[PDB]
Amino acid sequence: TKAYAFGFPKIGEKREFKKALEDFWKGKITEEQFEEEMNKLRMYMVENYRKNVDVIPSNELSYYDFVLDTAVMVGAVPERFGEYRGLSTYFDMARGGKALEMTKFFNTNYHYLVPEIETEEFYLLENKPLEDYLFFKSKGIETAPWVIGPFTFLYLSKRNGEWIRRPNQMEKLLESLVSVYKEVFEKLVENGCKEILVNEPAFVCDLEKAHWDLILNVYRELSEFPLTVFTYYDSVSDYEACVSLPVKRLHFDFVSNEENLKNLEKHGFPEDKKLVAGVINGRQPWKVDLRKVASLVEKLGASAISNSCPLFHLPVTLELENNLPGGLKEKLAFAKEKLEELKMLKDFLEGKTFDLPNVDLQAVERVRNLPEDSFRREKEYTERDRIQRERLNLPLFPTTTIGSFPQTPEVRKMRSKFIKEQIKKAIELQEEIGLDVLVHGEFERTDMVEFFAEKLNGIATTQNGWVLSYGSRCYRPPIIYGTVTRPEPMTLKEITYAQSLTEKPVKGMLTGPVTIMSWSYYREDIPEREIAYQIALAINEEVKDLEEAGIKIVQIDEPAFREKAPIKKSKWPEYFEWAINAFNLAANARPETQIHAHMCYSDFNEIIEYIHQLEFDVISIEASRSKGEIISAFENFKGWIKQIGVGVWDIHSPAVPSINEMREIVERVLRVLPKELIWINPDCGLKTRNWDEVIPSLRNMVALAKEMR
């Protein structure tokens, strides 16, 4: 049984990767010292592989993003960067003032950099795969270069400001692109490379037959090379086309989906090919029952095994996690432990090992037995709207903000090591500024998920369970290990105090159930919807307590509402059914309670009918970057009647937008939609901004409002 593994985290057990990058950028280490920090990590990764599997990947230590690496490889360096000068240019492309766009990588919380294709002519600008291959070879260690495939590369890229995803957009570019891959592979083979790991996750997207016609052509051109093709994150819909590719070895992800298995059972698997069975989950941290996996492997008839998807979606090692709830650690397995699982699975399958590891009722029942009426509020919007508008007495074009305020070094220090003082001062400033609806600033919160994850039962947090989000930024995902419930009030202290300082309405501030799940690990042996409902009910407990304490407005932040959706559109209806229900459980509030849903993602076009089913009264959106055009989905929706909070200010920029810059967005929004619907707010929270920027911007949106009235 040939064991593969791929995507082992690059960050190191003490986040040496992060320290190396940030030291280099700050300039306190040299370029040579940086390369040495990276070489240490290279060896660290390879040692982990060597101890556990048969095929050792190289070309995995990307200095910022592997999709950016692929772009550099094929000479896709946009004109604005000038000549490619190495690390200096690489990092300017990654994190500079004119960096490539950053976006989520498939349905994961890793963010890649979007290549911008300016010329139809690719060339081999840099051969990193050979460089890494020779680095290890020179040490007497054979490795298989890990590369992004040509189809996936184009599928992840943009040209003329839009995706390159129609078959008639990809054809000509593929011919030129493949020429460069051919050159890279020839070089590898000429230097004795025996196997190359080619990653084609885009095979699992919604593709058309015309796509597969192009893919076949591509791989016919590369049929002379020792390629093993990987796919993951979902099933490959055109199974027959995929297994017909002229490649000797083909990997499938048999964990994220049921269709790969069903399809292989239905159509079989070509005798002229070897199946690599992706059977160990790279996205969840649960020890698996190896006896069951072994049976699956046998059923599949696979001669090789591997993780299902890249391991970099997991933390490095569970080893030093010694303050987890009782019994938990024994059920977990992070990246290092996943490699050891593949090792044991290979051993067991080879007959070399015989001993394998074994591996809140009231809340559970309440969810399983929810009344059918649980997913709607007492009164519908029209009736709610009247009651709320009378209770609040807000002017036309009311102004508000999204929740978080700038964090002084003091604020960050104190939390790391008062809140009542910051809240007072923040509420004071808002009043003096002239804002209509106020917030408490979230000074007491590390981030919108962790803050709540730490206060809920059924959820654990780790000490060192770091996972790469992008560049040098890591986060520790919570682990939802059991029934979720809310023992004690989470935010009442802060909001209550806040409201007691002003006659103006202060927002309750909560994070939705879908977002909490999207940024956390959770259990696989429970339906996703059950987990979502459990969390939703726990959040609703907080909502009740807030409105009981006299809070008139409550905001539920659901930034991941679309991000959490399946890769395949055919799976959207089932997903949104529970996502909607979960949100509605959380938002189940009294008619006099005005609910705000904050959803700062880029477009609503394909999901407006789902949004329409949500029980919020106001929805805040990010409209600045699109100059209001994002409103298209809403104005195009016959029957839209709910209030929209229009983002007039890009909070990711330090600039202070002019009254006129804000005005343009609001006016684009009033082309169709009734003025009574419109609120004015920033795109999102202000936690990453400076007070020097925030205060004048706020005064500007207040002034724009008064002007619009």
Ligand SMILES: N[C@@H](CCS)C(=O)O
């Ligand atoms: N309430 C959060 C939402 C971020 S999506 C904030 O204002 O930072």
Ligand SMILES: [Zn+2]
């Ligand atoms: Zn937001």
